[model samples]
Target chain A: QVQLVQSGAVIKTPGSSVKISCRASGYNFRDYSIHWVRLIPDKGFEWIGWIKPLWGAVSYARQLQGRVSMTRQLSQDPDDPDWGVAYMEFSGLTPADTAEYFCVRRGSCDYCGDFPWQYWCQGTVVVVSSASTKGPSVFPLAPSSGGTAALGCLVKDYFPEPVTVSWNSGALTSGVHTFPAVLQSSGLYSLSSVVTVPSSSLGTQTYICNVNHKPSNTKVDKKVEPK
Target chain B: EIVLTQSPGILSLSPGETATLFCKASQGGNAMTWYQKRRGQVPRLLIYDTSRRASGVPDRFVGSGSGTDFFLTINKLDREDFAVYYCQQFEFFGLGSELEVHRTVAAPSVFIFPPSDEQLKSGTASVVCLLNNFYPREAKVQWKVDNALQSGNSQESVTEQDSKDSTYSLSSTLTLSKADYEKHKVYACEVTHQGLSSPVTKSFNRGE
Candidate 1:
């Protein structure tokens, strides 16, 4: 079976570039094209670009044109019998290229009727964005059915760049009784604040993790529901 | 302007084999993101333009190998992931090959080349098929000798794996031999993929 194996972890400073590789094995090297993509920590997914090894062609995300390049190798050629490896590099980093990079077999994920992508390599983690660097916290799944609940929202070591926390009522924000904050995390660029709303406000609202990195830059938010 | 070539239709894979597909960039761009589009649900982001794993992708989904070529692999293949997968380069369009930017850039052509005849041997040969200019991980490469369900081979035939993009190209292959090859020798790599043409079939010949 052909497999997509990625290179080891890459740690880079802001404004620097980092390169990683994904190798293929057990198949022909030129049959498929590899698509490069990015997953911002907690922010989910972002499409970057793709590369064509046979002709050295590239298609990049409009936002990543000046920041990334995806290339291939010969030793990893399925024909060469060497441990295949694909290379992904990130340039002009701004503490943002910090996340896992993986090289997957091309065309395997297409739901074209069959299950594609038979093998996936171990993900390579990059911590360039400089978030709290903390494991996701587990707030108590309380049954505060009677009244308002004050469940704290915290993103440690993710401040100095301006991130806030808010509460939503699934469909909308309570607005009338909501407080957003930009707290600190043990002397780090982290965040910590509280959102208090009625338990009735509970089933109706959802707690969110919002980070306002730059002015006019829309707040990147993640929702947390009551258990 | 992003020009997407759907696989003609949807591609069907054997429960255990790897499915490979293609996407291309006639112009110079960087990212080729992958997603799975089910019948009624929104397309789920499987791989990003830079080859980062989505939130809950299992270790079974691997992408590696190739200079400009990329691969996607699924270990211990499953059934639920069956649906159409798409490869998009956000460097240009937002959805469905709609050229958001300049439509001047030519749409890249995607081709699935059977392994060069030299890659296939008279005896036991393991050939990897390739898809040029296309993205989205899964697809299939079947060997057709005059078009009949030929047996006498291992059940582990026509497989697909994960792959990443190359700065230059993409590809997949069929690994078979001369003996069993006699039966299903006219090799055809038909991919049931989405976001592109459906069932894009490329035939290959012996000694070519």
Candidate 2:
């Protein structure tokens, strides 16, 4: 079976642009034309466009005729485009651009010009929002000697809903709890995730908290110290 | 430009009930494709090339069509099968239609792999998180060591269909050092999926 692997979700700011990737494997990539589809949060799916990597032929849905563009990586030959990889770029993003995009594979058809898409890649979510007011603030609370303490990464005043809180360069033995981002009075977002850790271990551990506010695709890392 | 319009905007049915949806295109087309999009999950290709179900899809879900008229039928609906359905015409670009179907949410089965002897000797070990039969694919898998987070360069597989039950599966792997492994420190895999009240987390110690 042919497989289409896509990049994960991304958040962008208005006026910013984003590119999504679709990697094809398991079958002859050049044998089929590629189709890109989009889905808004509550609205249904929309066909973005299609591209034939072999011939470098491309076409777009009338709805996104000029807003979207397709590109393919070229092989070592330079003249030959790599059929296994495809990219779709969307420019001049807006809140309305927030949606999930998918890639589908189709073969040439006699009547419709191209057969219905045969396979699909998981969708990649894109969100466009305003600039964030603040990044993330990370701190580790006091622990009971050999017992656990609450280590938290607090992200505040961010626009757009999605955020990914990650821990890097630290050893956490307890459950990592992420609270949903709460809408602040100013229409921004506040989100946090806490993990319990041995207080005694804090003396010997190097802990770093990574918070990503997707709207601006900005990542902030704080080396957490004992409070 | 060709356009597709699907009928029965919403389907509110219980388990074992049947559902039928219609898709009409503005122009004639030889082929059509059907997709299912669950809340918080990526859309799955249900039927493709008209009348043919995608790999791992059950017989309960059927598709048929010719020219501008297409039909999708769900016989004896399974609770997990509830979601929105979309129809797309082969010749038409940018035109697709959908219908909404509702149901209850289902949880996934998670597994953590054991460390290897080579890892034991080398003071380095890699643990794996395998989530199976999950519905509504909006999910996250994370790993932690001792009590701190292990982030960077984790390997995660794409969600794939489970032919046996018509669900989905995904896996992630995290590698750690010998000092952390031989010490028998706690390792955890936390899973956050949509529709669940809380995240599902599983942990294991070395030698398990």
Candidate 3:
């Protein structure tokens, strides 16, 4: 039975750095590999990377490559020294980097290659936020028939997900609106919401999209008009 | 990129019945690996380098074929062998298909035997732990000394499946120093299986 204990929660600023530590106990710490994993609050798990203390081999997930660096500290035995300790540093933090990080110890079994992660460390939460937040841009499509159209709000480059997108328009009820958000390759989030308008209220009505992002209390409003 | 597609989206079978699973790759590959993932458990390597079974895998589970075509055949299937199995190429992974090997639950019997007298006299000893008659072959064996975790240098025997009852039996051996035993240290063996709510631990003190 091996134990991996991670650092406590951290609050980091954008463009800065934060180093997370995982201490190993109850076994030969150097014998096993330490693999890092992350869990976005609403999103699912992500494999960050892994470092082998024995052979000094390191690799990161393609999505995290270049953005993350993995290194360890092998304490030198001195008068009162600790040996074989490992830690990982994540640099250039952004609001999208907010998540819970965990360190897992890989199984020592030679045949258990695909089935690593024998033991898991308690997760450490890292919250990254910025005061300046980017909002969405709304565009209304041409009416399919008389005075009825669709409004689309492209929500791009936002951080700390679970954004709220709502619609408000003149004499129009909020019905049949779709909002879906996806993580962009740049580590930010991009989503779009579409609102359908009744043919009778198209030309006479003006639609407004309200995007509320809570972490920074940022609100964005976009209006669309049908000719 | 070679995409792998498994036939028979789902496999529903009873114990003692043979099941055959087929996997087809879009492009020919030199080798393939097969894996099995039980519910709530990480996927384990079944067959690698085409047909060679991973360490501790049963001979009854066979992997064959070559190129873009490969298959996994189970002979005299047991209840524990039923799970999700998939095939993988270099960069492509097949969607996992379900295999239900149905069987009744059976609690495993766990025991720890004393170390040898000669071992007790010297500074070295080998403690044997046995897990018997478990329906599931996926179980973990661990050793501890004086409540401290002990791993590495432990040997696990190949699983033995009984034909009469279709149950499985396996054992692990942990070798340690006799000096610790002479000091009246407490030694324990813990077995963790899916059938048990918690790990079953057996401990022995000196002169017990």
Candidate 4:
């Protein structure tokens, strides 16, 4: 019977950390301890620690020490008509930690079993570790069977120069494929690429699709297979 | 400084059996809030004032079985939930003073065993404690592994609403890791509140 609404997306580099905030919407803020949890990049989840908002005291679950820290963002003024917010920082971040994070309010509930924890935030994903800060290198294919598979690496937005797409499997680089937008929204840019390779290429071949971005010199890779 | 203590961080219960939660503030305070925390999320409030429902809570979370002997009555405990629950207490100053003494968050007492653990481990190995019942928010959970703190093993968190009662309760879980036997390890639940002489400390199994 409770709900948690969380903050938006945050972008950070390889060696950088990011903090996500979750706001409580349905109940009183001070009634319970705010526990912080972490979801590994494309992986499972784990419990981090718990913090008392008013007192600033903490009780951690041994497994989470240097990786995360929980702090409260006090209301601007005593008279401010708003519930407080807690700041959860994920430090020493790698390609991981770049997953969706949410805020969960803990308290008594009946909807599920009234076991105290029943609500969850819609969850916001944090995209991290962009050497150039561009989005991830995506490779989507129809779950193909054996043989020469059609695979491609693509970067759509800002494309001028200093950009390169590398194939992890040493597959030859095909010319850039661009898509056109309609009239009302005429000049917006988008890009795409497609490659036809021999089938029967099972395990052992790595088709890496990489990108080169300037200023930040960011590079992201996408793995492909010649099925 | 009021120190709160709840033993056996994780709890397990059969459908009809009533579960009793004990929140003892080091120093008697005016209120205590109860909550529950699952994996990678903020804790949720379940009961306030020992037996009052915070606004919008379902009637199923019947806060009865009164006093320090309060119980979070879930008529027919379902399997979807029954995670950790916390209890915290703080001094509430109305909408006036330029600065009021408020404990926003507190460590919680856990309840129920996660299905994953239920299938693997059993007993007190699943219990955890909540301690913010007599303090304010602004506290965090700091853990230690092999007597030393570990890093990068935690996930982001999520939380629910405010408590209706002036004071509240909270909870946490140990997950009952099957890798190693945490039986002898000393897990300490500590608190650091404003204007307090020292942070409060409570051992996991033993009443230290």
Candidate 5:
């Protein structure tokens, strides 16, 4: 039961490049071959290439041969158990390069033959746009009914995509789930998060969905309570 | 030695239903107890013997059944009834199960995802269909290639229950060998749900 977990996402500007990585566990890293595939939002799926750690060999799609490359983390300390890393890097990114990429695991068949992929990374979505380290607008949504409520905080209009959220000064990290930064209609990014808290304290206590914009060092505190 | 297994690994239901948590034992019908834990509170014994209720525990937490099959039923589950329930029988306490109560029912939106360009070049390829914003968290997804000798082998990811809402989402993928791809041109993603009146199908034509 080998497992492949991919890096969450990459958001960069036009002409920039990004490297998406897939780290494997529960199996020998070099014992299997890996392939790179992508799903461009509007253009459908495209096979970027494949890589075999056996000899550090790779093959690619003729169209992407120039801009794409695949490699593994072979130059690591032998003691590191998680050295099984499949890296898919893309250069000269365009608006068309904005998509979700998948790394798949193929069997250990010898020679240059192909086998059905048994495992796939959840996927890494890359966003390419003309952007900056703009700050986000934070808003608090209504919490649910019951003793514990899943509080939703809407953070929008941000750029460069790195944002950290917290409730009440930041030590409360256990009950939070931050969704991916979403591309907005206005070309900026928006992120939504949920934090479960006691509903009885909704109006009595000030629960802040504090937004920390990583690049710009900007902070916005959206409080959820009786307005 | 008796092994125990719980059903509905993760339970999803409306708040008002009488949720019955199943705890099946390996050996024939055996005397089993139950423990209930709500957040920060310590676990409490609800039923120490097969049918007898513990002191101070409500009678609504009833137990029944026999011959490898057993059930711990909570009658008329309320707002505060949602908690982690565990089954026990001395020296063994099964892993607790979280019973999530969702109030809303929703119909999913669907989309078709095709295979990668590199896979198309290989002897086999895979296409995925995505489902979003549905409720109750269970669905049947299928891939039917119109007019084909052999269509495809497909599997769907476990439905994801959203953290902020009761809505669920999942991805279904269709694996196709080169022969399966060339033999058929039109591929359809059939999504069947309890919320929908009929199965919704999204078709993908390779050549057209």
Candidate 6:
């Protein structure tokens, strides 16, 4: 029943500063350890830092150690006192800071690796840029069963990138590939994806592409059916 | 990180009583802190700076130590004081000392289940320790490889009570490298609880 609820997405100007909060509940706040991790678009998981609110002990990743800070807050209830909230603050933000940051309830892994973690906070996204927010236009692309069978979708006019594209519930499926988003000359962003399924299951199974554009909080689903 | 030792791992006392727990740091000259961890929950800070009571901590909780020796003494031990206490110094955590208010102890059944073939092929092997049929829902575990103290292994567990029986059961897991596992060396799981006079050790080596 332990929960780590985090702050929502925020898009800020480069060189600005932002502080993200993760409030924990259902478990003792000071008892457990809380650490921060990030998901880079293509670079994979990054370990930011970890903090023990109980005694104010912290271990941070050297990559952004100078730019980021970790802090905490305790519950005010007299009947129960605790340091129930962990915070990750980023100063001197940059476009490179655009990613999904997470606060985790750590397992036994100490002094290093973030593996064997216990629970995760719903990711808090920090988008650093000067671009204005824009909702993506989602449309289903044509399906072709040529030498290589394929289904496609287009996500255009989205600002600040970092949209998630998935099939169905985002569960794993074969031959699914999404190309990286491109910054169009028009000052917006556009991305594409093509999924290749079994030739036999074509048209028999309906495939839907779900694109989540965080800036506008718009999630669009585009469906493609093979002929 | 320094290895820390806490004495009399199972300290017994009742409500309104006083109990003292001590921690010995392997190395001196660094700061030390103490924590209180309840059943099925995370740990919270009780004392920092070796002797300072953390904010909001009840006055009954007292901590004091300098150099290699540290102490945490709780006076007027209430029902809520019956929990595990630990000492941590500069990133290393001390093995916990359980302050038990309940003497109704239930011993655990210990055994290790081998890793699956899928895991072996994936380059890492996982072993499960069945430390089940226990009571009070408080069990601690550590693993050993070939009689040597092994560190860096991850452990995860879950506790479920029997449908009718009031006792609790837990399945704790150990993960290791496949190449190391193929050596067919013996693996041991050490379990600690207030019920046992000593940690119960169960080992598995290949077929045996």
- Point to the candidate with the largest lDDT: 6
Q: Which digits, one per residue and each the tens of the lDDT, describe model 3 over residues A1-227? A: 56677888776889978889987777766666787877665343566778888766888877777778777766565742433656778888987888888886645555445333446677788978653345433333223334434444555557656578777733444433333454444455655555556668766666777778775577877675542
Q: DockQ (Cα-based) per candidate?
A: 0.01, 0.10, 0.01, 0.03, 0.02, 0.01
Candidate 1 residues A62-115, lDDT tens each?
Answer: 767777877776663344654434677888877546665655444444432112
Give the C-alpha lDDT of model 6. 0.71
Q: After superposition, how far is residue A200 of candidate 4 from its true place, in Å?
A: 31
- Measured by TM-score, the strongest candidate is 2
Poorest 10 consecutive residues by lDDT, candidate 1 chain B:
B97-106
A207 in model 4: Cα distance from truth in Å? 28
* Residue-pair clashes per candidate: 182, 9, 1, 121, 3, 6
Tens digits of per-residue lDDT for model 5 on A101-152? 8886643434212423446687888978887669886655444244555455
Estimate the Cα RMSD of every predicted model relative to the unseen true structure. Answer: 27.3, 14.6, 29.8, 22.0, 19.3, 18.3
Which of the predicted structures, 1 or 6, would earn the higher TM-score when compared with the native? 6
Model 6, total clashes: 6
With a 3 Å backbone cut-off (N, CA, C), the pairs that clash in candidate 5 are A46-B117, A47-B117, A47-B118
Model 5 bad stretches (over 4 Å): A1-9, A19-32, A39-45, A52-57, A62-65, A70-88, A109-113, A119-125, A139-154, A162-166, A169-181, A191-203, A224-227, B1-208
Backbone clashes in model 3: 1
Can you write out model 3's per-residue Cα lDDT over B157-186, one digit (the tens) per residue?
534344346466665666666766576578
Tell me each candidate's TM-score: 0.33, 0.53, 0.37, 0.33, 0.42, 0.39
The parts of candidate 3 lying over 4 Å away from their true place are A1-50, A54-57, A66-68, A73-227, B90-92, B101-208
How would you encode candidate 2's per-residue C-alpha lDDT over A95-133 as one tens digit per residue? 788888888776333432354565678878896767554
What TM-score would chain B receive for each of the candidates shown? 0.38, 0.48, 0.58, 0.38, 0.63, 0.52
Q: What is the TM-score of chain B in candidate 5?
A: 0.63
Candidate 3 collision pairs = B123-B178
- What is the C-alpha lDDT profile of model 6 across B11-66, one tens digit per residue? 86767889999999989887667778675344466777676665457999999888
| Model 6 Cα shift for residue B91 (angstroms) | 11
